[PDB]
Swiss-Prot record, chains A, B:
This is Anionic trypsin-2. GO terms for cellular component: extracellular region; extracellular space. The gene is Prss2. The active site is at H40, D84, S177. It comes from Rattus norvegicus (Rat). The record marks D171 as: Required for specificity. CDD domains: Tryp_SPc (cd00190). Its main location: secreted.
Length: 223, 223
């Protein structure tokens, strides 16, 4: 997260870190046994860590659970990043509590102009790389599709939404990916991509979760 | 390497990749059993890979050897990055050949104005992150200490040198670190640090190898 702020400890309880001997992506806990992430975050073996604040320090709220089933959206298109969504069924249920809680699937597609919360342990710099210890927060609005499309000529699909600022300086970056964008307590997006980070005119692109509620449910059910 | 070019296959034979289940730093082969790198590149277990071009493809010239002794400069100062130099004695000698060759230690400190060659599998973007497959090359001059210091008020030590362009767009970036900067066939620097990457007025800083010839020799000898 570039230009964000350090989240109040255990304020983003649905926030999960996709670990593989290093933190490489984020995700959201949608139920005691399921995490939603980005298909570009796929790995054959993943350790999902919940209740994390400081990814480098054992603070005592952490729950570490192996991924059992890692299921990418079947129409995942690595070229375009269309359907860049994946589900992870944990090997066993987590203990929901104060710092290990779930987030609601979108009831509706949120309108442009809605204020969302983006979180992650993603790069925090606009140029070069800096990986933070503490989870980072960012308040940002959902931008009108027109601007999205304007920023990314012919690359925005209907399952993509831009969130951020046209002016730059504030954005999600590498490492935040597969991470959540929550609006009015519902998961509306997933950290997807953008050109550079926090660059003026280069809004961050996100997978539009409201386009997959069915898929998510069906899959969860079927597994 | 930002704004560099793809090196002619096996043109930088002294170039090594510090692997730990992923490429994380570069280094130089100074002899059949020794690699010089950056202390900030230290890890308890390292796999040194030589004869690499495409870090993701087995092309048949690769030699993969475990690090036996990983020795950081004793005055390594993690805070300032002073003495950011480390030696790796391989577990066994490599087969020197056409794409697995050594580089000379500096006979003298190279003057400002000298053209060097910087190489690495380091980030290739000025904003965001992109890891290349093929080794990247960069021709850049050694800048006058005055400019170095000017770019980094009170952070440049006498064992640091700036190399690059004040205008930006061309530089070393994260992942190039511990990597070589060769001038007239001698190793004059090690990829160290800089603010962002390829940013105007933010030259890359490098460890001045000519200040450690003795240390290198003494250590090599002593081990
Ligand atoms: Ca922790
Ligand atoms: Ca190779």
């Amino acid at each position: 997260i570039v230009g964000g702020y350090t989240c109040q400890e255990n304020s983003v309880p649905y926030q999960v870190s996709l670990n593989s001997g290093y933190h490489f992506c984020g995700g959201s806990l949608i139920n005691d046994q399921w995490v939603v992430s980005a298909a570009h975050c796929y790995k054959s073996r993943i350790q999902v860590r919940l209740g994390e604040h400081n990814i480098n320090v054992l603070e005592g709220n952490e729950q570490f659970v192996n991924a059992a089933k890692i299921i990418k959206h079947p129409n995942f298109d690595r070229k375009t990043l269309n359907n860049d969504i994946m589900l992870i069924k944990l090997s066993s249920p987590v203990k929901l509590n104060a710092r290990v809680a779930t987030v609601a699937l979108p009831s509706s597609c949120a309108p442009a102009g809605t204020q969302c919360l983006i979180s992650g342990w993603g790069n925090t710099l606009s140029s070069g790389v800096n990986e933070p210890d503490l989870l980072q927060c960012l308040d940002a609005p959902l931008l009108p599709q027109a601007d999205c499309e304007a920023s990314y000529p012919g690359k925005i699909t209907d399952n993509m939404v831009c969130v951020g600022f046209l002016e730059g300086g504030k954005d999600s970056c590498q490492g935040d990916s597969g991470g959540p964008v929550v609006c009015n307590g519902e998961l509306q997006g997933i950290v997807e991509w953008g050109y550079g980070c926090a660059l003026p005119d280069n809004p961050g692109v996100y997978t539009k979760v409201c386009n997959y509620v069915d898929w998510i449910q069906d899959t969860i059910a079927a597994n």
